């Protein structure tokens, strides 16, 4: 009640009355921060200097009645002096210590409930489990990770709506709660915040922390979930990894995503193996996701995915043969298709490389609010029958089907500001960007899709671009069914040695070719427990560790390469690297490198340690003879084709001669021991297939030549060739 008395007293004063009368509520936001105190430009020195003076702290004027001016030792706890620019009195830190010593105590059962975000950290750290610490060559990639997971069923708006309703129920305004999740959270918080005297601002700030999702760019190497990012400093180091399992329960979506990433990496690695089924079984039995063996997780988590299903079939479990796209579960009922990258130009002039699927295919889409039967061909929607519950649901299902079709009429429908690269310049998934853009605005897509006549059929009604149903016209190959469409069922399948899943009738359901090629990051850290502890790591880690293994075992690898190279090439340690070499060029590169090594062995001397270390991983795949000469070898890394130059140093693979150290993608891989047998003596002999690099040019045998043009030489003749980073050298064809 005293607030009205204070207002009357303020009104009584002339200046205060004028301020209160003239300043509007709108103007309050400006005068609220009207101060004279300028932000400190060197707070550390000012704090160190002020702690020496007698009264550096400022306390509310009320303290004068709550704390004696001096303690039992006579030290003055506070002063009658008023802080400049406020009513707060100036007090010494002795006052804070005295209050903490014998001040008025109150119940604190509300703090763990209001500070749940901070206390959950302690609660989950107390129940956390620590595994062995493994020293490795950690390769931390910078990407966006979750700092505060927030509430998965509430958006920013929903979170604020609950916040306001819970902390300031009267000041809520016109907003109204419109969700079961919002109502449940509001009820629980109100029940928990009964008789809470904590400052409402702190309650709102803590609720915002707990509810609003927050993300930040961090250099991560393990899981990107919040439960793992918070302990990122403790778990992932520059040269070590601490196996840690945070306490409490884990989000089902995080486990599903992590399992998908692990299964995709496992199938991609096992596909290049000699016995893919045996390799997959061993990897699946050795891999663990967030401290839980993948073997026991696959038996409880469906996570329908072209890789999860495969792994399950290998394990003998019944598969779903379904994949989730844009919130719709697609089941391929008939037909087959083959992926292939195609370059397209959108309606906003952007150029994309989308994975187009060739071949006629028929799918059943099941959604939370819709169900459709789709039939598509290569970049063309043949037919679509939607059975959505609501008009909004119908629009959502149609947009998803159109995006899934990949039709040119839809790509050209992209308009306005759409970016396929984030602020970090990373390449986003074009299908997801298109789906998001068209869900934000579908008017243009509907207008440009096209219209076709409707064949009168009972139960089928056409739909027009303005969303109103029609019986005579409809969108191209689109129908709406009012009677519903039928349903999920798991079918037992047989998997052969090459991971080709077939049904009871022998029809091939799943193959490793359809598994997504994107190298993603797991929400929950994935741990591998085999000798090749980096078998299922990402591209950069796989490359760095492969070359590190080659260098560490160099004293034996050199002997094996010089004596029995055919068996050395088949070493399992090169299989993960082969997972990154393009499938089409795998054989060409293997044959080329194998011939280069054989020619280096035939020519006495000319041994080049750096060249062997660099090209050894490319010889593992089976040879495929060709007349092609490669100036560089391409390896896939997070969708980018990194080029390893056959001759010379490149940022991807560099050998520093001063320190005699190898760096792969900027990560040190080791030092090369001084070999008396090296004796380069100028001649290289390991740059061109069937050609020896004599050395510096002399402008006598020829002005210049190209790498492919050099094929004209028959035998014995010498000529100048422009090979590498603009380095013309003299060469001889055998």
């Amino acid at each position: 009640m005293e607030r009205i008395k204070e207002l009357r007293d303020l009104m009584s004063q002339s200046r205060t009355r004028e301020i209160l009368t003239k300043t509007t509520v709108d103007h309050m936001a400006i005068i609220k921060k009207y101060t004279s105190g300028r932000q400190e430009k060197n707070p550390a020195l000012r704090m160190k200097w002020m702690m020496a003076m007698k009264y550096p702290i400022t306390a509310d004027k009320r303290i004068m009645e709550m704390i004696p001016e001096r303690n039992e030792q006579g030290q003055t706890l506070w002063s009658k002096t008023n802080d400049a620019g406020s009513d707060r009195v100036m007090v010494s830190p002795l006052a804070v210590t005295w209050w903490n010593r014998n001040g008025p105590t109150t119940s604190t059962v509300h703090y763990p409930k209001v500070y749940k975000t901070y206390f959950e950290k302690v609660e989950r750290l107390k129940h956390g489990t620590f595994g062995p610490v493994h020293f490795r060559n950690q390769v931390k990639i910078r990407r966006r990770v979750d700092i505060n997971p927030g509430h998965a069923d509430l958006s920013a708006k929903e979170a604020q709506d609950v916040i306001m309703e819970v902390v300031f129920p009267n000041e809520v305004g016109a907003r109204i709660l419109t969700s079961e999740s919002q109502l449940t959270i509001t009820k629980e918080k109100k029940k928990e915040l009964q008789d809470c005297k904590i400052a409402p601002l702190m309650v709102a700030y803590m609720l915002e922390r707990e509810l609003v999702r927050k993300t930040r760019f961090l250099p991560v190497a393990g899981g990107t979930s919040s439960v793992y990012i918070e302990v990122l400093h403790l778990t992932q180091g520059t040269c070590w990894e601490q196996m840690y399992t945070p306490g409490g329960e884990v989000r089902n979506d995080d486990v599903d995503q992590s399992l998908i990433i692990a299964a995709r990496n496992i199938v991609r690695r096992a596909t290049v193996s000699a016995d893919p089924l045996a390799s997959l079984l061993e990897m699946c039995h050795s891999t663990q996701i967030g401290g839980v063996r993948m073997v026991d997780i696959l038996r409880q988590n469906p996570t329908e995915e072209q890789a999860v299903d495969i792994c399950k079939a290998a394990m003998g479990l019944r598969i779903s043969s379904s994949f989730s796209f844009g919130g719709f579960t697609f089941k391929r009922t008939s037909g087959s298709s083959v992926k292939r990258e195609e370059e397209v130009l959108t309606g906003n002039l952007q150029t994309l490389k989308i994975r187009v699927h060739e071949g006629y295919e028929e799918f059943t889409m099941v959604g939370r609010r819709a169900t459709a039967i789709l039939r598509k061909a290569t970049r063309r929607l043949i037919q679509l029958i939607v059975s959505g519950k609501d008009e909004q649901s119908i629009a959502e299902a149609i947009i998803v089907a159109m995006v899934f079709s990949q039709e040119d009429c839809m790509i050209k429908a992209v308009r306005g500001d759409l970016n396929f690269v984030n602020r970090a310049n990373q390449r986003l998934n074009p299908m997801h960007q298109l789906l998001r853009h068209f869900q934000k605005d579908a008017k243009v897509l509907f207008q440009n899709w096209g219209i076709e006549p409707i064949d009168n059929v009972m139960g089928m009604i056409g739909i027009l671009p303005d969303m109103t149903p029609s019986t005579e016209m409809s969108l191209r190959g689109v129908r709406v069914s009012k009677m519903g469409v039928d349903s999920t069922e798991r079918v037992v399948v047989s998997i052969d040695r090459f991971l080709r899943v077939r049904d009871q009738r022998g029809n091939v359901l799943l193959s490793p070719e359809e598994v997504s090629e994107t190298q993603g990051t797991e929400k929950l850290t994935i741990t591998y427990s085999s000798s090749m502890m980096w078998e299922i790591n990402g591209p950069e880690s796989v490359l760095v560790n492969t070359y590190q293994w080659i260098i560490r075992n160099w004293e034996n690898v050199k002997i094996q390469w010089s004596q029995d190279p055919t068996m050395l090439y088949n070493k399992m340690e090169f299989e993960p690297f082969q997972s990154l070499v393009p499938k089409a060029a795998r054989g060409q590169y293997s044959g080329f490198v194998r011939v280069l090594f054989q020619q280096m062995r035939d020519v006495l001397g000319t041994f080049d340690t750096v060249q062997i270390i660099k090209l050894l991983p490319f010889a593992a795949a089976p040879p495929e003879q060709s007349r092609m000469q490669f100036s560089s070898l391409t390896v896939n890394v997070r969708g980018s084709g990194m080029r390893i130059v056959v001759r010379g140093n490149s940022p991807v693979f560099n050998y520093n001669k001063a320190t005699k150290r190898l760096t792969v993608l900027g990560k040190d891989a080791g030092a090369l021991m001084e070999d008396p047998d090296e004796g380069t003596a100028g001649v290289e002999s390991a740059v061109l297939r069937g050609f020896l690099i004599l050395g510096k040019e002399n402008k006598r045998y020829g002005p210049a030549l190209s790498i492919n043009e050099l094929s004209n030489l028959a035998k014995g003749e010498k000529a100048n060739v422009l090979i590498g980073q603009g380095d013309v050298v003299l060469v001889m064809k055998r």
Partner: peptide, 14 residues
């Protein structure tokens, strides 16, 4: 015959 949709990452149209 209300049914789910498994994984989902989409918002509502306008």
């Amino acid at each position: 015959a209300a049914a789910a949709a498994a994984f989902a990452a989409a918002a509502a149209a306008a």
